[PDB]
Amino acid sequence: TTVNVNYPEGEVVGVSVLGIESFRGVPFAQPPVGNLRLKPPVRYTENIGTKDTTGIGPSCPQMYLSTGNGELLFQLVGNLINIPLFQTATLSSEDCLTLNIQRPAGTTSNSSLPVLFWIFGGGFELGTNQYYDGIDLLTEGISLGEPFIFVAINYRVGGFGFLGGKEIKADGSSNLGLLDQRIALEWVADNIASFGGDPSKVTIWGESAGSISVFDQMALYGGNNKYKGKALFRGGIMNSGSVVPAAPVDGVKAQAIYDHVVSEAGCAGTSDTLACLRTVDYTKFLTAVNSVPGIVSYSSIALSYLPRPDGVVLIDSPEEIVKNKQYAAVPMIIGDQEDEGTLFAVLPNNITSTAKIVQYFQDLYFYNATKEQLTAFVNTYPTDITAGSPFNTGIFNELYPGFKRLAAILGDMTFTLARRAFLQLCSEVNPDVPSWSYLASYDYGFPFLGTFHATDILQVFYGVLPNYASGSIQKYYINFVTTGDPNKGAAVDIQWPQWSAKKNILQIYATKAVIVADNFRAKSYEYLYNNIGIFRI
Amino acid sequence: FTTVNVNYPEGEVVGVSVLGIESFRGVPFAQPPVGNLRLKPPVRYTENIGTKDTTGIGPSCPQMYLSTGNGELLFQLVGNLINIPLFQTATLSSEDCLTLNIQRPAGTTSNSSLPVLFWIFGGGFELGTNQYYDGIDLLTEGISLGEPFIFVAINYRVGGFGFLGGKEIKADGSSNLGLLDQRIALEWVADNIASFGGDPSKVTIWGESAGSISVFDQMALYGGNNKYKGKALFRGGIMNSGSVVPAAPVDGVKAQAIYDHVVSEAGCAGTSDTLACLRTVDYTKFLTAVNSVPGIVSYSSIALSYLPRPDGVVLIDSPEEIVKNKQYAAVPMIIGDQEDEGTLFAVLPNNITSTAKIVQYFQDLYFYNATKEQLTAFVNTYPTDITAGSPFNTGIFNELYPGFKRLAAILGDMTFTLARRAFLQLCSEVNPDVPSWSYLASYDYGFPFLGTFHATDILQVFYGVLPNYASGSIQKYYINFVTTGDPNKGAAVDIQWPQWSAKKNILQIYATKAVIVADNFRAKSYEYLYNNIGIFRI
């Protein structure tokens, strides 16, 4: 059972399964290939005709594992995965600037439904909309009387989306993944009504790197989120990630990354290194950008690829963008999984003392923090086995001596207490703009990892397993997309208090939720807030 | 959704008919080895099991993918997380796993009398199940060649549920349970397969890796007595990657240490009857305990914690001695190897980078009955030149780390590829009139770092991916063999596969062609292994 949409730019053949029409792999910009590799995305000028989108869309090139750093087993797999046969088997190519659109059966151009615009996460190195199907979430929306359009996009990750250095900067080529996101937003503004969505009711939603991207979209161009005189979105939902302090795109880390990629791509000593890169064949290029340290490794959260201030797209370090009121402030929901850091403390298992955590940070994370400052920060975290993450689990879950501590720290600085700082600053500069925040605990007891990073994809995005957490959060979100307030629309079980009222949040278990003070780990949070700037990665 | 019923001597099962093939998955063949029957030989059902729905996916026996107590921390972490009940349930894995799958052409009845291909999965005696070995592709090919058969794929217990050893296990008569599961499935087939349209006098057994070793062990079982109710349980064997595994006894030092470790982790140390105590341990804790020892995915690599070991009754002696003593059921047989058997297993032990280090590694984990002088002599038959090692014939390429291609060559040769030649040689000496055919697979030549590596035949041959000369010729040879007892008789073949003992030639099969070659490569290493086989008892 198929279904045509015609829109200004082309038309589209989707599938209608159990009450849901799905269009997968709708092109939104020109394939960033040859000429257009390592260049900003470009809109389609001419009509692109009729594409069948009853299939499975492509992914952008992935970096699951480094081809040049980390344990040999991982390097081996990292290289094997890059061979054409596998790239082809996974539908991954530079031809990836496509999105998916899912809607309830029978929706028409006449329809004026709210839009839910999803940005996947994968440490800015991997990820794709291929395994983010909005069926369960849209199904709940219909069951609640609050139907919506679901849009899930691809964007360039790894060295295809976030290569930096002085050359990229001058080419105006910084932060391509963000621009892919932005241009996907503008495409939605031009085309989504044809699909029966209200382009004036777009809510952007992301997890991890996608959540950070949500804040970045709010920040883009000094907070100018306007397209043809109208805002590109009206609300934002952030799961695990917001502001990421970061040195400039032409900074030392990014330049070192760029020079290494250029060496591996076989482009050193050439006249235009950046021009040369676009000459290198895919496989060789993929291998070279993937050669740097990857998230699955000792390096962990000290990412090789991430958004960095360029001065136009990302005008400044995100924390300063907030303090200076240079972001589109919109109603927003932000949350964290209770144990965000555990996954990221698994590999750096030789970091087992304050002194070693400090060295680790000075080696890879924070070039503009003194040994003294970092030592102070880490010392706000007890060595006490019981104080670490997974939180509230006693002497248990210590994978290695110092694990729960490191997990606590990595999880707080990057996501959970970072979130509170974000909330605090936003409440100060834009007090009239509402926010709601929550903590997820529905996997309490899960050995070693607890309610760890990305568990929300299962429990919330897919509703597995079906329980109080699944119902409550889904309903809050769908409410928020519909009304711009999680407590408005369908009837809610607990009134979610605005964060700036008392600085309370919802803590959501499998069985129930409760309102609690967002003041845990106060000394750690204090130091981070008062010293946010030294934490630029 | 079309169903088909089969009544047979022990019950009735309902299967599914799909695109010309009928499948019955999860047919019970022995009582569930749970409670008092954990760590006991399997027992046939003594009562009719009634009517069973077998139109879904069957279970697996408990798996050991990764050790819970040894190896890198990431692997221990994952090894532990995999064992939680939620995941065991999601993968349909539990102790109640003695079931098998039967697939046959649509329209087959009890009068069809088709030959039977009986498949034994490989998984290093630590993991594996019939769940992902669906014979649809092979049976489809059989049907298109006018040589239809019944495909039977079994579960058997692995890891500490199937190959736990030590003197307590030995005295209990509970050695080598996983081999007993395969054997009791063969007997179930003898009694029951005619009801499904198969001919029990035409059973060919086939396995890859641990399953291939298991095929030879089935020929070896009970001093070579493969008879049941007066009839042979199989008439042929196909061995992909593995045969004879010289091994110290089930009550030897290695096996006892594993047992003592498991008992202590399971909380049974010091009890009056530790083995009886193990049977009372809760599944999740028992699983964690048996999986606590070193796993194949680690530094220990192919120095396995679990494998068949001589017990004096089921496996009467070390396999090489069984062959020399002519105490195995000698059947027509096909045996092959992937060209680069060792590459996968040399990835993890990447600090083993010199002759001296290879020997220390072997002395420490592998061969307790080999001297340093002997092991050094064996290793010295392998050149240190990058071009000599595995992936073979790839020159200066594929050196994952210095010494890798060499370690890969040694691991693959001693365990699989030259062991195969020694097996063929001994068999031709004591049973000269029993035919054997052998081949080397090179259809993945050029694949980076691993070459035509261990288990690549699961894709190319078992599933026929991708369709090419290799899938075509091997499937046809195997199907001919199942039907006629000779890979060359049945459907016309492109190349006449010579019997091995005639001139000691084998087929070498590439993706697009095959050639006859001499089975005499790496002669010096072979010669040493052959003349000193007993020192390589693992």
Ligand SMILES: CCCCCCCCC(=O)O[C@H](COC(=O)CCCCCC)COP(=O)(O)O
């Ligand atoms: C094959 C994967 C299936 C995962 C099921 C997800 C369950 C999530 C939740 O809804 O269930 C919850 C929690 O599940 C467990 O904490 C383990 C989940 C681990 C998640 C990552 C693997 C139900 O448990 P319960 O509190 O007993 O109701």
Ligand SMILES: CCCCCCCCC(=O)O[C@H](COC(=O)CCCCCC)COP(=O)(O)O
């Ligand atoms: C979805 C991908 C898996 C199918 C692989 C096919 C295997 C056999 C052969 O036909 O393939 C190989 C494919 O390439 C490599 O040599 C081997 C692939 C490695 C697979 C191991 C995971 C056939 O090559 P060709 O001669 O080009 O047909």
Ligand SMILES: *[C@@H]1O[C@H](CO)[C@@H](O)[C@H](O)[C@H]1NC(C)=O
């Ligand atoms: C820990 O291991 C990493 C490699 O994963 C290494 O770079 C670092 O120097 C080591 N640090 C300590 C303190 O052992």
Ligand SMILES: *[C@@H]1O[C@H](CO)[C@@H](O)[C@H](O)[C@H]1NC(C)=O
């Ligand atoms: C080693 O050989 C002896 C006889 O010399 C034998 O009894 C013993 O079982 C062997 N041990 C191993 C490891 O096979």
Ligand SMILES: *[C@@H]1O[C@H](CO)[C@@H](O)[C@H](O)[C@H]1NC(C)=O
């Ligand atoms: C190699 O590494 C393993 C694990 O790190 C270690 O146990 C073993 O002693 C090493 N072997 C050598 C150096 O021969």
